PDB file of C-alpha atoms and ligand atoms in Angstrom:
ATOM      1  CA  UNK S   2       0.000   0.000   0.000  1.00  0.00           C
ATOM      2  CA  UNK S   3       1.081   3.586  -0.034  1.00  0.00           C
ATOM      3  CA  UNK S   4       1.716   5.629   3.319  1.00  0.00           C
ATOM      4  CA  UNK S   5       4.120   8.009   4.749  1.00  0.00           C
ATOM      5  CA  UNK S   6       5.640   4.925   7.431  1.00  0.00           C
ATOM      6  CA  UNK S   7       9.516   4.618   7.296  1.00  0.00           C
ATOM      7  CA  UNK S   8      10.066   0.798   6.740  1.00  0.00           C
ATOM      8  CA  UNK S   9      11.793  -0.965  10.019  1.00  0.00           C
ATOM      9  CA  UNK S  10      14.660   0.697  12.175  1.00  0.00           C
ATOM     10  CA  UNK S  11      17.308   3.089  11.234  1.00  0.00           C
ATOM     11  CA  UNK S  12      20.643   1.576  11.755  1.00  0.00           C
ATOM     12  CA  UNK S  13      23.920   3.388  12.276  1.00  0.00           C
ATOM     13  CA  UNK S  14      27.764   2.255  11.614  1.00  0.00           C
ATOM     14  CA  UNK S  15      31.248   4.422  11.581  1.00  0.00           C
ATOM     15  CA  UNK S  16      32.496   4.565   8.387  1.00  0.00           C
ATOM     16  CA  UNK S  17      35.498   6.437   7.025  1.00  0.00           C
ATOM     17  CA  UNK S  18      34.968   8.662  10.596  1.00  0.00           C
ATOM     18  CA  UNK S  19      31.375   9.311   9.688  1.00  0.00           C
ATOM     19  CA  UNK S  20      28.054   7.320  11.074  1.00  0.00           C
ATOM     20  CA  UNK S  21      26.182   6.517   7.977  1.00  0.00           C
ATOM     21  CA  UNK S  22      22.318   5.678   8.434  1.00  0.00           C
ATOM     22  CA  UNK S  23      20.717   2.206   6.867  1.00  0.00           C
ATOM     23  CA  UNK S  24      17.589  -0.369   7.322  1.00  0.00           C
ATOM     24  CA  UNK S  25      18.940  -3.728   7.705  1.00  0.00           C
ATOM     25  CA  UNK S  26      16.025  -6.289   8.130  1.00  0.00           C
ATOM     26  CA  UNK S  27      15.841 -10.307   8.003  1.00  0.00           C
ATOM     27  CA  UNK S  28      18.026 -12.425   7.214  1.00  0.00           C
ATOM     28  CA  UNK S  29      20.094 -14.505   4.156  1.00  0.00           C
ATOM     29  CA  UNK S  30      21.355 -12.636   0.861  1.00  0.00           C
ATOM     30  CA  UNK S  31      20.666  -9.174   0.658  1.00  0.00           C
ATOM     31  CA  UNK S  32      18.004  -7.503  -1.531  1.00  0.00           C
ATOM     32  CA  UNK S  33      19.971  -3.932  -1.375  1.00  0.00           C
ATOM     33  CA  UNK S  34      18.054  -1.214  -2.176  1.00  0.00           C
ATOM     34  CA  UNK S  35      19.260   2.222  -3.258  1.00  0.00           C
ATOM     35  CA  UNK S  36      17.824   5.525  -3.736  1.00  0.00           C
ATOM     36  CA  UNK S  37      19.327   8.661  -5.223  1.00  0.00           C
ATOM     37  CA  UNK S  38      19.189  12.418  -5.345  1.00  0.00           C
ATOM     38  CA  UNK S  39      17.296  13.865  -3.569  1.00  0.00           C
ATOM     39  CA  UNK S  40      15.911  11.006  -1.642  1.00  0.00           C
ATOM     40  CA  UNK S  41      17.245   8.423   0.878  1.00  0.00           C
ATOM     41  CA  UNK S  42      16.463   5.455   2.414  1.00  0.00           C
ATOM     42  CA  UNK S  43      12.652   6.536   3.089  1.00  0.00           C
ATOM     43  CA  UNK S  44      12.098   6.207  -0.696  1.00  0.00           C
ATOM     44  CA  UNK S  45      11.823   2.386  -0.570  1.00  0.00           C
ATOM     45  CA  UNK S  46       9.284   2.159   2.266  1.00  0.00           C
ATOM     46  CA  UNK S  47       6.286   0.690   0.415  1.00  0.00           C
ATOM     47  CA  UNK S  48       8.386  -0.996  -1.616  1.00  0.00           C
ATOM     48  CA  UNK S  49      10.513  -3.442   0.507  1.00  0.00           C
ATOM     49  CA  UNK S  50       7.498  -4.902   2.503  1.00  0.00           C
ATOM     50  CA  UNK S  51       6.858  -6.927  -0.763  1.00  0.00           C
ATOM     51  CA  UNK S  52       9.919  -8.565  -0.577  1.00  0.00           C
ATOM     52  CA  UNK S  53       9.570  -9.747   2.705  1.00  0.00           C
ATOM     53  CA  UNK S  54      10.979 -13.185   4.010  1.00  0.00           C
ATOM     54  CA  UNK S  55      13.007 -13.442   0.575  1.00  0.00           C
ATOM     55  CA  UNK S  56      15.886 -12.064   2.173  1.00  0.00           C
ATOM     56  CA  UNK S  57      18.009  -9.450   3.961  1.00  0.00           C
ATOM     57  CA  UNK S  58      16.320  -6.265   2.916  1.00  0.00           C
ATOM     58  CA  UNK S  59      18.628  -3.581   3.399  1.00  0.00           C
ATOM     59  CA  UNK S  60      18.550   0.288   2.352  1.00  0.00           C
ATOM     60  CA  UNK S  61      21.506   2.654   2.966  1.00  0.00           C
ATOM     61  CA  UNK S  62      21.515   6.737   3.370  1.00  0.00           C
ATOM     62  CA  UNK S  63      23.921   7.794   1.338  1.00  0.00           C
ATOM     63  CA  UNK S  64      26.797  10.484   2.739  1.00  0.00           C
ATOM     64  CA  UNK S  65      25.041  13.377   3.466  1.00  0.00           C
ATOM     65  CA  UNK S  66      21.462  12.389   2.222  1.00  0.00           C
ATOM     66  CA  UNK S  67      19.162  10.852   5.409  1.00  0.00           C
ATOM     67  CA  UNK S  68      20.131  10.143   8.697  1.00  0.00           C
ATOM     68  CA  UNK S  69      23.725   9.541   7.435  1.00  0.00           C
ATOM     69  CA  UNK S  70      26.080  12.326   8.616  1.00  0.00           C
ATOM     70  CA  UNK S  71      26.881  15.364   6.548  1.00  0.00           C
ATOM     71  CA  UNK S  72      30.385  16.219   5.519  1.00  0.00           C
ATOM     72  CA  UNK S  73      32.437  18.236   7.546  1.00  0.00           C
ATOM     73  CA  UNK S  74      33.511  20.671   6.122  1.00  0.00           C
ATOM     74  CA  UNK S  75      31.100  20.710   3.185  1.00  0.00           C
ATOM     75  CA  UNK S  76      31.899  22.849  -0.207  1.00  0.00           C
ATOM     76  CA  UNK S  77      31.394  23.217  -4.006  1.00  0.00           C
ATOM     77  CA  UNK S  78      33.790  20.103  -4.594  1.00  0.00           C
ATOM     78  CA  UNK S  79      32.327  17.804  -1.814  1.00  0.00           C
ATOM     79  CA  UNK S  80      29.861  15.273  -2.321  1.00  0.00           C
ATOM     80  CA  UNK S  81      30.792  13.999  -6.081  1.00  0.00           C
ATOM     81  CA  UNK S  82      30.331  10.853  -7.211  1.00  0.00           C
ATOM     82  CA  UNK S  83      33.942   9.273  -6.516  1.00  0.00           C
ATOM     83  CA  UNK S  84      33.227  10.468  -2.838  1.00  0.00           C
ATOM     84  CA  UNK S  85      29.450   8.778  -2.332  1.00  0.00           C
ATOM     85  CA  UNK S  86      31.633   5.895  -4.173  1.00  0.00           C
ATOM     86  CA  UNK S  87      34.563   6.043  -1.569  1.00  0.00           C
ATOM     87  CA  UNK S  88      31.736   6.318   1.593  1.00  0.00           C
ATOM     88  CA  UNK S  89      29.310   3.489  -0.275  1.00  0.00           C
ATOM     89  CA  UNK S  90      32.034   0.606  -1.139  1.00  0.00           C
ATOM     90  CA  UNK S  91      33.101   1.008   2.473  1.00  0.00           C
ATOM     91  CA  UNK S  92      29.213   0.448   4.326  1.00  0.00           C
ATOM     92  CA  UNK S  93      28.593  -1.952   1.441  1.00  0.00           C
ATOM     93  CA  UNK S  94      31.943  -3.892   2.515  1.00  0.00           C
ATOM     94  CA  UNK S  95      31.136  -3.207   6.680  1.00  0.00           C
ATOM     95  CA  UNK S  96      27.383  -4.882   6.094  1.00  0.00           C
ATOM     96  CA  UNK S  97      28.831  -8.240   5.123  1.00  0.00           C
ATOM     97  CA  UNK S  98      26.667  -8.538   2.368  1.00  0.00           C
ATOM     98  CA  UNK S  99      28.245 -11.984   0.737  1.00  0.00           C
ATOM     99  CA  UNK S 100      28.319 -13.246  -3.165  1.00  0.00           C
ATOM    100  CA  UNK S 101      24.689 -13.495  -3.746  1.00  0.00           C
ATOM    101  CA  UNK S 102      23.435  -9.841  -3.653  1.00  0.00           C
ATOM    102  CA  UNK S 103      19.985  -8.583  -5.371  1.00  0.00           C
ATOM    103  CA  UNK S 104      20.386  -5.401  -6.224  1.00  0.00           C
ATOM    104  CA  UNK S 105      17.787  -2.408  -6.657  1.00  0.00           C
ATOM    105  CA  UNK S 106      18.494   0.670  -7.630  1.00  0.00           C
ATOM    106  CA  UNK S 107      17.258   4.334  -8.894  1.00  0.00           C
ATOM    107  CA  UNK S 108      18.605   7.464 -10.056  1.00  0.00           C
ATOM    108  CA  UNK S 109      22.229   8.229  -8.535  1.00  0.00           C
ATOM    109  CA  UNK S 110      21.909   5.022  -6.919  1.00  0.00           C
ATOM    110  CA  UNK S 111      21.898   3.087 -10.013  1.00  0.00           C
ATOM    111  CA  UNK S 112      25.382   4.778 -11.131  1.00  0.00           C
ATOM    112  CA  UNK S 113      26.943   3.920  -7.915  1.00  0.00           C
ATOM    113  CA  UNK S 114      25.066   0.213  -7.908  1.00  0.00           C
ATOM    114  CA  UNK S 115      25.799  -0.144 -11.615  1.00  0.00           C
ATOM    115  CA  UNK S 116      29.322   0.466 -11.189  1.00  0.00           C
ATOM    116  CA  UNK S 117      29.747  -1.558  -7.792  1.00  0.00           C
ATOM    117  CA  UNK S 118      27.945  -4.575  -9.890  1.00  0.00           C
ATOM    118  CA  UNK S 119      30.755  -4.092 -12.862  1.00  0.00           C
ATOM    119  CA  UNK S 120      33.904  -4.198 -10.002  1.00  0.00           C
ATOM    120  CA  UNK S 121      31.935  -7.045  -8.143  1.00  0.00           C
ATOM    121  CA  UNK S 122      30.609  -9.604 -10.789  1.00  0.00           C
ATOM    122  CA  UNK S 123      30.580 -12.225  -8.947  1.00  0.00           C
ATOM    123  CA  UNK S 124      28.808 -11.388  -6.202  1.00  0.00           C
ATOM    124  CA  UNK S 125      26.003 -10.074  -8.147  1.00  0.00           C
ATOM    125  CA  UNK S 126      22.924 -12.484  -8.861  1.00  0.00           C
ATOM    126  CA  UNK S 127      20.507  -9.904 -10.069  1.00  0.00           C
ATOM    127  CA  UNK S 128      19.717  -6.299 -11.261  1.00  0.00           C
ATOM    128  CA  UNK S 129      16.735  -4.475 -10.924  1.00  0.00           C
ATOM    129  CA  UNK S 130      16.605  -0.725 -11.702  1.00  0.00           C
ATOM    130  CA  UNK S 131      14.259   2.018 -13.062  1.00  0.00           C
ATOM    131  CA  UNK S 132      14.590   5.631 -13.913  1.00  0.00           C
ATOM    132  CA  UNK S 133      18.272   5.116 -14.334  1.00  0.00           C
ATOM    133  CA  UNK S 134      21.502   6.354 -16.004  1.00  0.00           C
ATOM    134  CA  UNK S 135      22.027   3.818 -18.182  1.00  0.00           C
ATOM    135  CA  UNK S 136      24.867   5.691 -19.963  1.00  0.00           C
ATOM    136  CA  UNK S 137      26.692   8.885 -20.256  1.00  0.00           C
ATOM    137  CA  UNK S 138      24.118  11.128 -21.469  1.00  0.00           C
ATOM    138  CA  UNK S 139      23.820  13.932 -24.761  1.00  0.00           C
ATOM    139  CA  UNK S 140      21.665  17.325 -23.751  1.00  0.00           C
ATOM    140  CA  UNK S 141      19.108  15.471 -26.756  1.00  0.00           C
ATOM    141  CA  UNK S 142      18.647  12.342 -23.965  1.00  0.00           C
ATOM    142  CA  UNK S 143      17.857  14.833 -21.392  1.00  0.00           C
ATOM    143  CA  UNK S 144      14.093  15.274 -20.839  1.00  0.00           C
ATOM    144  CA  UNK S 145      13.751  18.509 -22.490  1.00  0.00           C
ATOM    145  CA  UNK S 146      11.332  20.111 -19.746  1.00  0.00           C
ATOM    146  CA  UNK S 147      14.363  19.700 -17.074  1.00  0.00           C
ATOM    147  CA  UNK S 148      16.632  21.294 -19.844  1.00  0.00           C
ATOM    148  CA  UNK S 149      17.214  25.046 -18.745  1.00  0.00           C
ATOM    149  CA  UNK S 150      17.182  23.834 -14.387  1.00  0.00           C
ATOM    150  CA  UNK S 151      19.547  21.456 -14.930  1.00  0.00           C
ATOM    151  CA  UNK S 152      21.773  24.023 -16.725  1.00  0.00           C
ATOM    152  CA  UNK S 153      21.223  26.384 -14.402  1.00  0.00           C
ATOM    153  CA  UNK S 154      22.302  24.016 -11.543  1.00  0.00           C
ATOM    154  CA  UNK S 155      25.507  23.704 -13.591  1.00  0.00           C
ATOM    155  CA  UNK S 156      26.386  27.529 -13.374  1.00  0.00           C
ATOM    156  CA  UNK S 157      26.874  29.524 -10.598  1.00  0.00           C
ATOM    157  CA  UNK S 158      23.284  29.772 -10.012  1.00  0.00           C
ATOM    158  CA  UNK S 159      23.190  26.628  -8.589  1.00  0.00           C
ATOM    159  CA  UNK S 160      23.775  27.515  -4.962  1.00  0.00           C
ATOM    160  CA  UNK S 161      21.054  30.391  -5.065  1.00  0.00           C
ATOM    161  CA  UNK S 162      18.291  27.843  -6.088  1.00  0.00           C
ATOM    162  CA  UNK S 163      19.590  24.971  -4.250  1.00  0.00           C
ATOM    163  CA  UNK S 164      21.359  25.835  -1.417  1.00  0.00           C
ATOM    164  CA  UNK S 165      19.344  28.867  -0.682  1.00  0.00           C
ATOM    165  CA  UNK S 166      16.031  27.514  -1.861  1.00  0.00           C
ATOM    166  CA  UNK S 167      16.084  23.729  -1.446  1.00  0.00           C
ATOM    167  CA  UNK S 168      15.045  23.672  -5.377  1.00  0.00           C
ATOM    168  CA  UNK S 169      15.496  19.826  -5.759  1.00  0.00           C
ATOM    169  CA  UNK S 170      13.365  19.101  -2.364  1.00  0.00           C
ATOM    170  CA  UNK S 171      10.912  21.465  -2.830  1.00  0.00           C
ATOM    171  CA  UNK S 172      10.380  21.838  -6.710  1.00  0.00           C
ATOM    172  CA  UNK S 173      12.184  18.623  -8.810  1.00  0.00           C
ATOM    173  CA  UNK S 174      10.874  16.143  -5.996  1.00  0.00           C
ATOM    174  CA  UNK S 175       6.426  16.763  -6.069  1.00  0.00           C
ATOM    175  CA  UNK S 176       7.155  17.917  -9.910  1.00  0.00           C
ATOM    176  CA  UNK S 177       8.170  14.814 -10.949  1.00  0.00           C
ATOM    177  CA  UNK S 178       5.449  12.333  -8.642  1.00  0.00           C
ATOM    178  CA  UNK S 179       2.627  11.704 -10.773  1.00  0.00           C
ATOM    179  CA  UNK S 180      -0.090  11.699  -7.030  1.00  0.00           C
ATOM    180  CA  UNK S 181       0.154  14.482  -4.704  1.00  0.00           C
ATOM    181  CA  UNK S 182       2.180  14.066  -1.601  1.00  0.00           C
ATOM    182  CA  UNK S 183       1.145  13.850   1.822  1.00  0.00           C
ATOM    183  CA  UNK S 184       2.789  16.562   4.779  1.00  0.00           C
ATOM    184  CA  UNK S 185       3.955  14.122   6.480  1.00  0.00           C
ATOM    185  CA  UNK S 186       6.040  12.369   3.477  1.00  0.00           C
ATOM    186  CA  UNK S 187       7.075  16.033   2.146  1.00  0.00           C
ATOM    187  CA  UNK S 188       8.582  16.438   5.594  1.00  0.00           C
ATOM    188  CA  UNK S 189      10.293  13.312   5.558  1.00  0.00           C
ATOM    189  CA  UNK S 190      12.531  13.944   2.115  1.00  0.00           C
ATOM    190  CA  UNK S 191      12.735  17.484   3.607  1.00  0.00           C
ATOM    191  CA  UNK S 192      13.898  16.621   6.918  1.00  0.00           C
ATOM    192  CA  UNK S 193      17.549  16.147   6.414  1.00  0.00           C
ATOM    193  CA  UNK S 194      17.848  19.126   4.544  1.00  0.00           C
ATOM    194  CA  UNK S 195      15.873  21.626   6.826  1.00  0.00           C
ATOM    195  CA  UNK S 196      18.801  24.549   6.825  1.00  0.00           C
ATOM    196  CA  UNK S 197      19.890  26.632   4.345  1.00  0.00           C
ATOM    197  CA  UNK S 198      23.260  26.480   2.739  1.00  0.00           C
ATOM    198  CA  UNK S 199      25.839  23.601   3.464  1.00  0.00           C
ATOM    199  CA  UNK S 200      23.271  20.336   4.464  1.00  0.00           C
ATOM    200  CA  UNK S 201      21.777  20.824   1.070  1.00  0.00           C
ATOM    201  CA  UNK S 202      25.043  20.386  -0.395  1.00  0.00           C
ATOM    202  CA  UNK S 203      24.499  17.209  -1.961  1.00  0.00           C
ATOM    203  CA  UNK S 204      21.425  17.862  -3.563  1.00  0.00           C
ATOM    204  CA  UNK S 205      23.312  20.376  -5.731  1.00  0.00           C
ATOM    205  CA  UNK S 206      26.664  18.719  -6.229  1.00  0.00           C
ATOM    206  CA  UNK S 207      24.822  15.340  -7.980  1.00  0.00           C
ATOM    207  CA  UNK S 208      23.220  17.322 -10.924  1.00  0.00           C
ATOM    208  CA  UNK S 209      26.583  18.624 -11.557  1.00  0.00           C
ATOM    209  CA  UNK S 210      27.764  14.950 -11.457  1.00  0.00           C
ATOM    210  CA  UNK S 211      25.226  14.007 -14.051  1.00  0.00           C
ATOM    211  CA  UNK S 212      27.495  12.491 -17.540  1.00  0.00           C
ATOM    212  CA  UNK S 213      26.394  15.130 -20.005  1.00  0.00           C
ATOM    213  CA  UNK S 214      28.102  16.145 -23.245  1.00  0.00           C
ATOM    214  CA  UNK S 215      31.433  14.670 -22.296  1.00  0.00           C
ATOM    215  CA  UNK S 216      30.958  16.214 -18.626  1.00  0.00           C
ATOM    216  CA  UNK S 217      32.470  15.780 -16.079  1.00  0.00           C
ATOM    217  CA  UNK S 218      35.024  13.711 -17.470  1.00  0.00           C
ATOM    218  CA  UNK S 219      35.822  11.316 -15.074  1.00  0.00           C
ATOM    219  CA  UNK S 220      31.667  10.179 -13.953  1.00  0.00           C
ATOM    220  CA  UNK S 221      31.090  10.156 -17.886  1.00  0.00           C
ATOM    221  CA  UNK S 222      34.302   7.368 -18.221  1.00  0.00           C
ATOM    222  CA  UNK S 223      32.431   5.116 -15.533  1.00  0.00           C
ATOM    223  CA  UNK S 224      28.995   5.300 -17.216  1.00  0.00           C
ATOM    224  CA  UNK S 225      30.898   4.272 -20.122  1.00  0.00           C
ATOM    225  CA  UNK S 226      32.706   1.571 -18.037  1.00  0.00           C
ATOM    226  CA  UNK S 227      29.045  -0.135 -16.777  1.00  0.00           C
ATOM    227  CA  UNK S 228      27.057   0.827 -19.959  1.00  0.00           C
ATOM    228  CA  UNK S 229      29.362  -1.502 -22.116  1.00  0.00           C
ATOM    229  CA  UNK S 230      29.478  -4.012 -19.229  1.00  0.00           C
ATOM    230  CA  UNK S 231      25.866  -4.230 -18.958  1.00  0.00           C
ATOM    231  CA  UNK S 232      25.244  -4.414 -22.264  1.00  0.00           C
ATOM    232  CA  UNK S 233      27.229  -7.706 -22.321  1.00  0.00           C
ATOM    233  CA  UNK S 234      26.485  -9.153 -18.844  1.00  0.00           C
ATOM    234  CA  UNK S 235      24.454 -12.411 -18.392  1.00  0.00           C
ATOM    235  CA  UNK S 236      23.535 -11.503 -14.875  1.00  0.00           C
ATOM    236  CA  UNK S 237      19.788 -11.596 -14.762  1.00  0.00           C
ATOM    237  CA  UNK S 238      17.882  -7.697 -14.943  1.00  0.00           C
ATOM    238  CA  UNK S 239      14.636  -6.518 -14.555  1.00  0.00           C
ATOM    239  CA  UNK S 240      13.952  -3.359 -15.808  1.00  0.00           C
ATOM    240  CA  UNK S 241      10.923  -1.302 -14.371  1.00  0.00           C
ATOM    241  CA  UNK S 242       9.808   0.911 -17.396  1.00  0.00           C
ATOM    242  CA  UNK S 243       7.729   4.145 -16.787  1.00  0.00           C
ATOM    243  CA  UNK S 244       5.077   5.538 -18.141  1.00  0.00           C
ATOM    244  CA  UNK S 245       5.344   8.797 -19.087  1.00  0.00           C
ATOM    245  CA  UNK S 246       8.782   8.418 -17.729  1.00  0.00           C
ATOM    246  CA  UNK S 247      11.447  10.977 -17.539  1.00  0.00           C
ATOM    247  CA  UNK S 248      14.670   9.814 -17.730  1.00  0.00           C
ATOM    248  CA  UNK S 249      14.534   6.653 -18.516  1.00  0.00           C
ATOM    249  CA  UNK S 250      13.034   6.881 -21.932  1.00  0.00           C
ATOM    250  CA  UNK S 251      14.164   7.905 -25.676  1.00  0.00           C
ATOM    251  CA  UNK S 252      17.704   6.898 -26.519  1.00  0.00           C
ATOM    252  CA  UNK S 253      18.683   5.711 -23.129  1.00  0.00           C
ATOM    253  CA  UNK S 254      16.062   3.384 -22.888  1.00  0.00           C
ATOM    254  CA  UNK S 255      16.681   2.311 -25.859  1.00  0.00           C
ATOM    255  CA  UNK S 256      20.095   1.528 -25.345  1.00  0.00           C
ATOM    256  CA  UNK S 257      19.093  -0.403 -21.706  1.00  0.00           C
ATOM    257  CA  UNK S 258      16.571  -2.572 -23.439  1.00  0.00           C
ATOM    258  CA  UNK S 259      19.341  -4.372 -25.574  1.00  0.00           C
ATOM    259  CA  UNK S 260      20.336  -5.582 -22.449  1.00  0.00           C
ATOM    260  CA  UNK S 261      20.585  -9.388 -21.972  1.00  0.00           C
ATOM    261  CA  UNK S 262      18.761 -11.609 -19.996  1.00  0.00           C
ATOM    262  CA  UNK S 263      16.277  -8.507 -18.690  1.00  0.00           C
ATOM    263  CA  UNK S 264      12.655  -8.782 -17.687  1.00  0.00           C
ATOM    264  CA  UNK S 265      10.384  -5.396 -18.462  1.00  0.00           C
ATOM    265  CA  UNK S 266       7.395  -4.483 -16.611  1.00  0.00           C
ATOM    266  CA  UNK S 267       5.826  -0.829 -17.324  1.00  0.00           C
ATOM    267  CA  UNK S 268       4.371   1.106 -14.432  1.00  0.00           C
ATOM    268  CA  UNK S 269       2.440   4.230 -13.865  1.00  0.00           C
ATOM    269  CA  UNK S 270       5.028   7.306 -12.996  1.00  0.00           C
ATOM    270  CA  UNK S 271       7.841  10.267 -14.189  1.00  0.00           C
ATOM    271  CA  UNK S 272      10.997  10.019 -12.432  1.00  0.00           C
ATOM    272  CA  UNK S 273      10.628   8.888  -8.394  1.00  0.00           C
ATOM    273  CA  UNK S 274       8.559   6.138  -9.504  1.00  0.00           C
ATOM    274  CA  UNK S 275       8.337   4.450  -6.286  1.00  0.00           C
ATOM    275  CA  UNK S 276       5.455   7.226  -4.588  1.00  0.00           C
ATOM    276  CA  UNK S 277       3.317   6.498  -7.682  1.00  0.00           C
ATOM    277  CA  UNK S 278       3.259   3.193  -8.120  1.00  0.00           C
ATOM    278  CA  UNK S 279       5.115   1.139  -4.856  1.00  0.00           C
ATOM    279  CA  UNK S 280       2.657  -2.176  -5.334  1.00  0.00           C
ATOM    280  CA  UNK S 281       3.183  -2.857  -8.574  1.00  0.00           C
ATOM    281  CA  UNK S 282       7.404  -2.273  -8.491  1.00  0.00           C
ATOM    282  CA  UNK S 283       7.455  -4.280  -5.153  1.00  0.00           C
ATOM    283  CA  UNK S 284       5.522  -7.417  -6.517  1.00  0.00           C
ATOM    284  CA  UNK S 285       7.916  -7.008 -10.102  1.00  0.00           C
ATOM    285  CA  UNK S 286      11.035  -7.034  -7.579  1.00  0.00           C
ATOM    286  CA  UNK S 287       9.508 -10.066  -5.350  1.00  0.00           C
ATOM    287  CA  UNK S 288       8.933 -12.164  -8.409  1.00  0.00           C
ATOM    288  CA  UNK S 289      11.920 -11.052  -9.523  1.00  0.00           C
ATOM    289  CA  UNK S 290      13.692 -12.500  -6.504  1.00  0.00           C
ATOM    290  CA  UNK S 291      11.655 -15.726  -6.208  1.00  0.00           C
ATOM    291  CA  UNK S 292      13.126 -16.814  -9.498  1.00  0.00           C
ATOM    292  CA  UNK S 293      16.212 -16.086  -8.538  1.00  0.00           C
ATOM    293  CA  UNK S 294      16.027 -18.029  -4.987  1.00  0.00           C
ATOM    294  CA  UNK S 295      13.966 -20.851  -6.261  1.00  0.00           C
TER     295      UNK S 295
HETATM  296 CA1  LIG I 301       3.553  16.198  -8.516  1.00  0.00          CA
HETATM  297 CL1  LIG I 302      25.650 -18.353   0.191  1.00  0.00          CL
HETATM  298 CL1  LIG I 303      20.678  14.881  -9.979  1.00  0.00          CL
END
């Protein structure tokens, strides 16, 4: 069902002289779950019930984002991808997640899962995603109503609208979830980023990570790096289509639906897919699952 309910208990663990923030629930191989900008942990909630008893459902906060501490000190070059990377492979490695892990991923959390799945192989037995960077991106792939923000987070406006403003929170976030949002689920996704400047940090510094037109340089070689791979890969996907979509359509989703061995479902939704429709991409993921834990 829907509802604004965080799902189990938020954990915490030291890592890299930070606590970092996670649900770890049941037990066997994990089913690990992760969200992106400018969500956390919270954005699974009605989505990992479904799953339940078919594993060790776990959902981290990434640096920053959450209940997972901020950087300290916090500026324009904290919080890029190589530095959620650094922070991620080291809870992912602390959680003792063995060589049978499901994962499920979204947004900036498919780069960072995509990637970890590449330099991991082995240890991956499955890959669902949705609304995804699927590879490094041309300004043409970008949805073209998101066109002129996204730029403009990419200047030196940026820190006006999202620092000052809490842009991605309070506009990107309800403008691109299909039902309207309930206060207590807006203050959720708002609550780690209640003051101005700094603790929004990393809800700016992502859209600048974002592979576009050869930039930046070293983000767009990795999407390279796990587009190739996963256009090769016999690890089993599923791939939770949208409809309308946002990012995850045109040319990109093109390019993800020559992957191999991939399952497609279509659900109702634009980019945080999971507040529109959490039923049907829970039951997708727990089939999913089943088939691969016969
Ligand atoms: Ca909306
Ligand atoms: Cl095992
Ligand atoms: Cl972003």
């Amino acid at each position: 069902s829907l509802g604004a309910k965080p799902f189990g208990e938020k954990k915490f663990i030291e890592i890299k002289g930070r606590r970092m923030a996670y649900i770890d629930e049941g037990t066997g191989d994990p089913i690990l779950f992760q969200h992106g900008n400018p969500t956390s942990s919270y954005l699974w909630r009605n989505i990992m019930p479904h799953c339940a008893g078919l594993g060790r459902l776990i959902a981290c906060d990434l640096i920053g984002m959450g209940d997972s501490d901020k950087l300290d000190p916090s500026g324009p070059e904290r919080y890029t991808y190589a530095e959620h990377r650094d922070y991620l492979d080291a809870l992912w490695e602390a959680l003792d997640l063995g060589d049978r892990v499901v994962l499920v991923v979204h947004d900036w959390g498919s780069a960072l899962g995509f990637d970890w799945a590449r330099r991991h192989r082995e240890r991956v037995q499955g890959i669902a995603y949705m609304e995804a960077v699927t590879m490094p991106l041309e300004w043409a792939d970008f949805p073209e109503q998101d066109r002129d923000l996204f730029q403009a987070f990419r200047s030196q406006a940026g820190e006006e609208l999202v620092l000052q403003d809490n842009v991605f929170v309070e506009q990107v976030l309800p403008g691109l979830i299909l039902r309207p949002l309930s206060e207590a689920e807006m203050a959720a996704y708002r609550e780690p980023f209640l003051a101005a400047g700094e603790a929004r940090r990393p809800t700016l510094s992502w859209p600048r990570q974002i592979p576009i037109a050869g930039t930046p340089a070293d983000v767009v070689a990795i999407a390279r790096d796990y587009a190739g791979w996963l256009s090769e890969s016999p690890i089993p996907k599923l791939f939770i289509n949208a409809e309308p979509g946002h990012l995850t359509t045109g040319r990109i989703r093109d390019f993800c639906r020559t992957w191999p061995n991939q399952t497609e479902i279509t659900v109702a939704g634009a980019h945080f897919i999971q507040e529109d429709s959490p039923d049907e991409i829970g039951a997708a993921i727990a089939a999913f699952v089943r088939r691969l834990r016969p």
